[PDB]
Amino acid sequence: GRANIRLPPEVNRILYIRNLPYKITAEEMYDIFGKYGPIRQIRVGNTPETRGTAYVVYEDIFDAKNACDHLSGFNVCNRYLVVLYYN
């Protein structure tokens, strides 16, 4: 059996983001991700093959999934972002 219920088990509080700008500060990131509520913790790529992408951690799974949808196709600095879950 495979039914359809909201708040799916395939999602976690850890959200992967792609197409992030190469030049950004914590100042901007806390203003962007904090727009939806409190943020648990953030890390950013520091190697040549990680820079440009990052994973964010929300305090809840509810608020995470709420913003996950509303942040899909969001355009900033004339570029669109991409959201994915932690597998």
Place this chain on the structure above:
Amino acid sequence: GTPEQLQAWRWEREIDERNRPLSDEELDAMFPEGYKVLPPPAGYVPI
């Protein structure tokens, strides 16, 4: 004179233990390699 000698053995896996629950520290173990932490800027005072 006697060529006194010895032998060597091995050991199996370690005994049971009780790993911590899904605490904050597991987030470090779950994050990919090459990702530095992003703490907030010093003196940040939002509204």
